[PDB]
Design an enzyme around this catalytic site. Sequence first.
Site: not given
Length: 310
Positions: A45, A50, A79, A112, A153, A203, A205-206, A209, A258, A265
């Site tokens: 993505d 970016y 996008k 976007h 988006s 997005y 999802a963690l 940042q 990441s 990994r």
Amino acid sequence: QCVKLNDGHFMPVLGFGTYAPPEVPRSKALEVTKLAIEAGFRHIDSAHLYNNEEQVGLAIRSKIADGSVKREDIFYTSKLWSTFHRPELVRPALENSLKKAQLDYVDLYLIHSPMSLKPELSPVIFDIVDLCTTWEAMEKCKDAGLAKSIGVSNFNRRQLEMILNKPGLKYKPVCNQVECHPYFNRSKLLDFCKSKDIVLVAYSALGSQRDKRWVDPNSPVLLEDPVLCALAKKHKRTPALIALRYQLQRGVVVLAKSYNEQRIRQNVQVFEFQLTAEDMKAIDGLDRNLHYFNSDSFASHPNYPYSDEY
Ligand SMILES: NC(=O)c1ccc[n+]([C@@H]2O[C@H](COP(=O)([O-])OP(=O)(O)OC[C@H]3O[C@@H](n4cnc5c(N)ncnc54)[C@H](OP(=O)(O)O)[C@@H]3O)[C@@H](O)[C@H]2O)c1
Ligand SMILES: Oc1cccc(-c2ccc(Nc3cccc4onc(O)c34)cc2)c1
């Protein structure tokens, strides 16, 4: 592991997020995108915004040239940025992204954001553009073969319906890429997309940042949530893997950024375990309508997606 889009194409359910703040050298995007592909990522993505399409495309091209993958194995997304919503600017913007990435086509091109901006990427001065005319231009990019699939988006339900109910519609959006995580799980939007055969792509999802420029530092840290930490202990995984697996088991395609080799990994381990029904219910209960990205300064835009928050 892929899901069939409403246009017949297939999208891997786990994608690699490539955005890094300007302080990160552009060389890293080339390095980590290769690491992602080597770890098993096939969905990549990116976006004009970016400032990494050159490096991301180089990574894909290198892994194709070295024999690791074929172009058909890679699902590449870019996008259309908000200063190019005017229909005559759509195709040149896609051609420019293709030129920068040294690709003949993107697998997915997205609007976007619905909040059109004055034709600098961040001029903020708004632009009044009927997104239906933007979408028609996107449809022609798919007809020309420059984008295999097209989607949107940061649209809300109302904005999707504006496209789905457009007269003469040729291609439904294959997906809607939105902020989605246990603090903001978009259950209602998700059910709506499912009912229309639209894939919700998550997005942040963690937990995002947490950039001081967009994110309130006092907002709760998703990966330190007690529920995710307990669940990480139970399954002998990590909070990140719990958050990623949560999205997969509710039918969401999930992105994961990441730039750290070990965590890149690690994130492919999401396919190695399952959450219980009670686990999923506990994660559901964390929902609190928390958006990490503060778009309050843009609340005046006619197409502001989070309208009627209160
Ligand atoms: N359409 C849009 O408007 C929009 C908006 C935001 C994001 N996105 C896309 O979605 C992608 C992901 O969203 P995001 O950038 O907000 O980040 P994210 O996926 O929520 O990840 C946030 C942070 O999690 C860390 N992380 C990753 N794996 C981890 C693990 N296993 N354990 C612990 N920490 C881990 C990463 O730090 P490290 O790098 O140090 O590992 C990363 O900075 C973006 O890169 C972009 O491609 C799109
Ligand atoms: O028309 C408009 C009007 C107002 C704001 C915006 C607007 C839309 C999306 C983004 N995106 C991101 C921000 C921070 C980190 C990120 O990582 N990946 C991303 O996409 C992303 C920033 C601004 C568009």
